[PDB]
Amino acid sequence: DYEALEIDTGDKWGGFTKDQESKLMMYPYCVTEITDFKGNHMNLKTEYINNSKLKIQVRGSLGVSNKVAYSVQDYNADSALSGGNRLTASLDSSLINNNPN
Amino acid sequence: YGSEYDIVSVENHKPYDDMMFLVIISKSIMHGTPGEEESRLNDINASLNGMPQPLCYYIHPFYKDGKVPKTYIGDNNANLSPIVNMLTNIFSQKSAVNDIVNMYVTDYIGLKLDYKNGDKELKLDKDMFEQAGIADDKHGNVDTIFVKKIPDYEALEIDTGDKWGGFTKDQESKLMMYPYCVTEITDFKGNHMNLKTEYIN
Amino acid sequence: YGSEYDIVSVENHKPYDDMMFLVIISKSIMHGTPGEEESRLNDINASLNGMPQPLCYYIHPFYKDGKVPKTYIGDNNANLSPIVNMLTNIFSQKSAVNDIV
Amino acid sequence: DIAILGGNTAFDYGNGYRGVYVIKKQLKAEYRRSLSSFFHKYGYKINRVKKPNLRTRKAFNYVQTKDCFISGDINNNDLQEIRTIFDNGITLWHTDNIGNYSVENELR
Amino acid sequence: NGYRGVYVIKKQLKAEYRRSLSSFFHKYGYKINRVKKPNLRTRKAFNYVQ
């Protein structure tokens, strides 16, 4: 079995300059982008990350050529949704790095 | 109604639950069977498999830990090899690798099978399958399954229960309709389909 | 809200930090192991790797300067060769570069 | 496919993706509150020619028509006004707590 | 050229539009589109209500 590795990047609002008007922190005024700079990227609406922190789950493989996925399982997750379910459902919103390398 | 949805429920269903099938295709017959009138190795064998067709099909059920269900063909235990040993041995026989044309895994082979997932026990019809011994007498023996014929495929039904299950019911029922709610069906392998739940009759 | 964004924060995260893996796939066994026994060279070896599969996998961790981490397998030092030497060596033997997939 | 001696099967199986998934989605709390409150006060868009629902809810009924037909023994000026009133939309209260929108206002 | 792993790039609107929108929100609050009771005295200095 393969398993997921978690990368904790800290407070999801870190790095943005906070304006007095909090609505300026929402999309489309702010956005969090996740990219591998190899053709894959995903714009996240920071407010819809159901967690105080931005956590990224890495998944991979040892098959015929390179394949790594970067997920934000908390994105658009209902609060009652389990971690297992979040991870499962996150694949269609993930950075799929499948350049063969 | 905003620009994103909350994912509020996630469920997974596999046709045969924990069991998957390995499929091996060859140009000709690779196996002996217990109580066969004469040797058939390297014979061409056409059969009904969805349609009339000239290749030989072998299948092998397995679990992710490499174990395999106790499999019966008619009244008889097929004595299936564990999948990893089977692969090693099958590709070690120089006569069998010349015949082999393709290999893949699938979640569903077109049949409802007499299968007990909890007991890890599979019963197959002897008119469609047979014990397949693939022997080298230099490398270890393989016990797998030969497909004699599958004239027609059939649909298997999966009951997921109440279609409104999982959604939170609002007092205003119109918030249960599309586009406020949606049921998505996906295999997470590039195929997906958005269903308007109210229209599932 | 305008036509462009300011890039206001940039961060990079790698699963194994400075370490990368080279993966080499062959049709059959290319190696000896401590405490053999009989030779297994050119034997077919299937294994569970994500799923059941018939290829042989070798991996080799490395850093961008060509060094390799002190690696243990169980209690035993693996005594890894440097990545460059390993490459030169694997591809120098016709017995077999033809096995390498 | 698996190698013999089209897509990355190892990544999928190794990470537990097989079979079919049912993912259920609904709009965010913010829009649920927004729309729910609107429907609560003003019902639903109907676009039907039918007789209007006047007293089908316990507390209040909102009614808005277009070009409505209303008859009766009434002088025509007053009858014209009544058509106009329902064509502009009106809330018919069925309890003395007029204007209290907090209540459930269930059927019957 | 050193590209490995994953990158988090955070983006926000330019100073010109921040000034623009912030000043509008400061004076006129937010678009709400809710049926509810209005906020009449929730701020220390003033409340806009429409």
Topology (elements, then pairings):
The structure is cut from a larger assembly and holds five copies of chain A.
Chain A: E1 5-11, E2 30-35, E3 41-44, E4 53-59, E5 68-71, H1 83-89, E6 95-97
Antiparallel strand pairs in A: 1-4, 2-3, 4-5, 5-6
What does this structure look like?
- This is part of a larger assembly, with five copies of chain A.
- By secondary structure, the first copy, chain A, is mostly beta strands.
- Chain A has one helix at 83-89, and strands at residues 5-11, 30-35, 41-44, 53-59, 68-71, 95-97.
- Chains in contact: A-B, A-C, A-D, A-E, B-C, B-D, C-D, C-E, D-E.
- At the B-D interface, strand 1, strand 8 and strand 13 of B face helix 1, strand 1 and helix 2 of D.
- It is classed as viral protein.
- The entry lists the keywords bacteriophage phi29, tail knob, viral protein.
- The entry is titled "Crystal structure of the bacteriophage phi29 tail knob protein gp9 truncation variant".
- Chains A, B, C, D, E are Distal tube protein.
